[PDB]
């Protein structure tokens, strides 16, 4: 990992990059012939928004997500990982991956409302004033359709719209 | 909240289990768990996070 240091020393600005030692991949994966990292460790269709230990390796220190080129994930899995990270942040997990702003933490606001499996964003959904009868019912989405391929031990399909 | 009158507390018998298992946040994982979970990929050394 490389970091940029900018120093001001008497009307002289010096900018230099320093290399920090980076943790490497574990030595023995169960499926050495895999292509993308997710299916190389037999993690295909076996992770969810709860798996913080997996989603904390494809995100930036300030909550952003690394590009697909660097990680090497396939497009199908990259979107699923992207969806899970968005759901993880809204669920309240990953508390150390928020940016630091000393001026803004002091003015507290209304207490946070606990939530999980939020498909959309809190500021972009409008109340369902006219719900409707059973033959034309506006169903509140829960979870994402990208995670409907996960393994179901119970065997019943996941109820995405309820 | 957990502000129950003493009269109500003395009447209780047993506590029902929680129906949903509360997931734990990243900071609640012990360092033993962090080292146990394998590192899936090896990021390049020249990338800036």
């Amino acid at each position: 990992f490389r970091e940029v240091v900018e120093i001001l020393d008497g009307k002289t600005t010096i900018i230099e990059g320093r290399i920090t030692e980076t943790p490497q991949e574990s030595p023995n994966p169960p499926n050495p012939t895999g292509q993308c990292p997710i299916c190389r460790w037999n993690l295909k269709h076996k992770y969810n928004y709860e798996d913080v230990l997996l989603l904390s390796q494809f995100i930036r220190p300030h909550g952003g997500m690394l590009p697909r080129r660097i990680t090497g994930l396939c497009q199908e899995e990259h979107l699923k990982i992207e969806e899970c990270v968005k759901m993880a942040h809204r669920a309240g997990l990953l508390p150390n991956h928020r940016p630091k702003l000393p001026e803004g933490f002091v003015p507290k606001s209304k207490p946070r409302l606990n939530r999980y499996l939020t498909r959309w964003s809190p500021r972009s959904v409008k109340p369902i004033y006219n719900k409707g009868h059973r033959w034309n019912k506006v169903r509140m989405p829960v979870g994402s359709p990208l995670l409907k391929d996960n393994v179901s031990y119970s065997g019943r399909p996941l109820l995405l719209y309820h | 909240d957990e502000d129950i009158p003493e009269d109500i507390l003395k009447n209780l018998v047993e506590e029902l289990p929680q129906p949903r298992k509360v997931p734990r946040r990243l900071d609640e994982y012990t360092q033993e768990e962090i080292e146990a979970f394998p590192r899936v990929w090896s990021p390049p050394e020249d990338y800036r996070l």
């Binding site: 076996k46 969810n48 | 394998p38």
Partner: peptide, 16 residues
Amino acid sequence: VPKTSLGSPPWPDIVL
């Protein structure tokens, strides 16, 4: 060894 939430079945294992 991966330890994902869905890696192992939710029901407790049984040894008869």
